[PDB]
Design an enzyme around this catalytic site. Sequence first.
Site, PDB file in Angstrom:
ATOM      1  N   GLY A  14      20.409   8.939 -10.663  1.00  0.00           N
ATOM      2  CA  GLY A  14      19.508   8.890  -9.663  1.00  0.00           C
ATOM      3  C   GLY A  14      19.722  10.157  -8.748  1.00  0.00           C
ATOM      4  O   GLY A  14      20.717  10.348  -8.571  1.00  0.00           O
ATOM      5  N   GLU A  15      18.655  10.674  -8.505  1.00  0.00           N
ATOM      6  CA  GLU A  15      18.493  12.222  -7.418  1.00  0.00           C
ATOM      7  C   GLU A  15      17.398  11.718  -6.185  1.00  0.00           C
ATOM      8  O   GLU A  15      16.378  11.917  -6.712  1.00  0.00           O
ATOM      9  CB  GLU A  15      18.250  13.336  -8.336  1.00  0.00           C
ATOM     10  N   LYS A  36      28.209   7.415  -6.302  1.00  0.00           N
ATOM     11  CA  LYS A  36      27.044   7.873  -5.108  1.00  0.00           C
ATOM     12  C   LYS A  36      27.633   9.114  -4.528  1.00  0.00           C
ATOM     13  O   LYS A  36      28.877   8.882  -3.657  1.00  0.00           O
ATOM     14  CB  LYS A  36      26.482   7.082  -4.445  1.00  0.00           C
ATOM     15  CG  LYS A  36      25.417   7.386  -3.180  1.00  0.00           C
ATOM     16  CD  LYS A  36      25.085   6.316  -2.429  1.00  0.00           C
ATOM     17  CE  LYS A  36      24.402   6.750  -1.129  1.00  0.00           C
ATOM     18  NZ  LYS A  36      23.671   5.375  -0.550  1.00  0.00           N
ATOM     19  N   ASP A 120      15.079  -3.252   1.209  1.00  0.00           N
ATOM     20  CA  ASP A 120      14.378  -2.679   0.189  1.00  0.00           C
ATOM     21  C   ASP A 120      14.453  -3.123  -1.138  1.00  0.00           C
ATOM     22  O   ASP A 120      14.567  -2.437  -2.330  1.00  0.00           O
ATOM     23  CB  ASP A 120      14.569  -1.322   0.398  1.00  0.00           C
ATOM     24  CG  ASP A 120      13.472  -0.309  -0.127  1.00  0.00           C
ATOM     25  OD1 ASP A 120      12.390  -0.643  -0.157  1.00  0.00           O
ATOM     26  OD2 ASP A 120      14.003   1.007  -0.267  1.00  0.00           O
TER      27      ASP A 120
END
Length: 260
Positions: A14-15, A36, A120
């Site tokens: 993930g970026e 992370k 979210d």
Amino acid sequence: VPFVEDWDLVQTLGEGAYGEVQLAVNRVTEEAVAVKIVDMNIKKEICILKMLNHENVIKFYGHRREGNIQYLFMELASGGSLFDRIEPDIGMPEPDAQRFFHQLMAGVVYLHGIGITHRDIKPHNLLLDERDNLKIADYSLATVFRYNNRERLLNKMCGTLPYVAPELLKRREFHAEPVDVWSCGIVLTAMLAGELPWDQPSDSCQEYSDWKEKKTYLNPWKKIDSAPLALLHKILVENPSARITIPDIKKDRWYNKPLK
Ligand SMILES: Nc1ncnc2n[nH]cc12
Ligand SMILES: [Cl-]
């Protein structure tokens, strides 16, 4: 290749805005985790992460500060995201959707029970392990809504517009739990129809007006069988005090339907 103490950072998973997530492999022991990387309110995030202990929530292993870069060590989900299992315009087989929904509810009941709201929920934040077990991930918007058995109302607007409940656009203060329930209903729609029903749940949104007028002969609803659609009629309810609660979701006919 970059490294942190005993761990190599071998590939990007993930970026985004909040740093990068890397696959980390212990050079000795061969253990794979997710890390992370935040390039320095993450004191809050770490405090919430240390609370999390459930099979349908990403586990926190610990963190390391090194100058202005924190490393958050978390359970690896090698199966990717629910996002990748949804065929656009199709969805996925109803039995797979039902199993993922059961797991998502188990995770959300868990978080609500320790007084945490995710804020979210969406398919990118729902990761799969090697056996396709669903894990709720990314606690960067998470907050406490119950402490010492006293509920506090939220007032910060956040989340992702197609997934947010209408009260969050309309009210100064609102209950946390019905907002997460709503976003779970939009995820169930996406799983069964491969399509989001509206850009945002506002009166200025024609697709949202169509739903309130019960035009279910339109997409995405005409792709959804009557049983899951009756559950979506109880979840996607505009008044949060009339919206179905998770205890009542667990009594729903489709929720309890045996499937392939
Ligand atoms: N983005 C991610 N990919 C795989 N596993 C993970 N765990 N926490 C975040 C992750
Ligand atoms: Cl979608």
